[PDB]
């Protein structure tokens, strides 16, 4: 719960952010989810982690969305010859 305190407070940025998401992935991939729920006080942590990573999901989704102009430049360069 100390690690998740510091992880939630890392989750605000975009630079100190992906490592927070990956250590969240680590602790929830390994631990028991029942144990994670019945740890007290942690719902106040996890409901503040949720909207930040929703925001980061939308941001990286728009990044990979606008990534396809390389595919458009490729199909036009194939149209060239």
């Amino acid at each position: 719960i100390l690690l998740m305190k510091r992880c939630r407070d890392w989750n605000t940025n975009a630079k100190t952010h992906t490592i927070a998401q990956r250590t969240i992935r680590c602790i929830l991939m390994h631990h028991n989810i029942a144990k994670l729920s019945e740890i007290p006080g942690m719902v106040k942590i996890v409901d503040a982690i949720i909207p930040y990573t929703q925001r980061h999901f939308t941001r990286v989704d728009n990044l990979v969305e606008q990534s396809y102009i390389l595919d458009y430049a490729l199909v036009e360069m194939d149209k060239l010859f």
Binding site: T18, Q21, R22, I24, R25, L28, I33, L36, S37, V43, V46, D47, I49, I50, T53, Q54, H56, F57, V60
Partner: peptide, 13 residues
């Protein structure tokens, strides 16, 4: 990773 964490943490909540 982000979508996995979103779905997992909101499952927990």
């Amino acid at each position: 990773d982000l979508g996995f964490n979103v779905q997992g943490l909101k499952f927990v909540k």
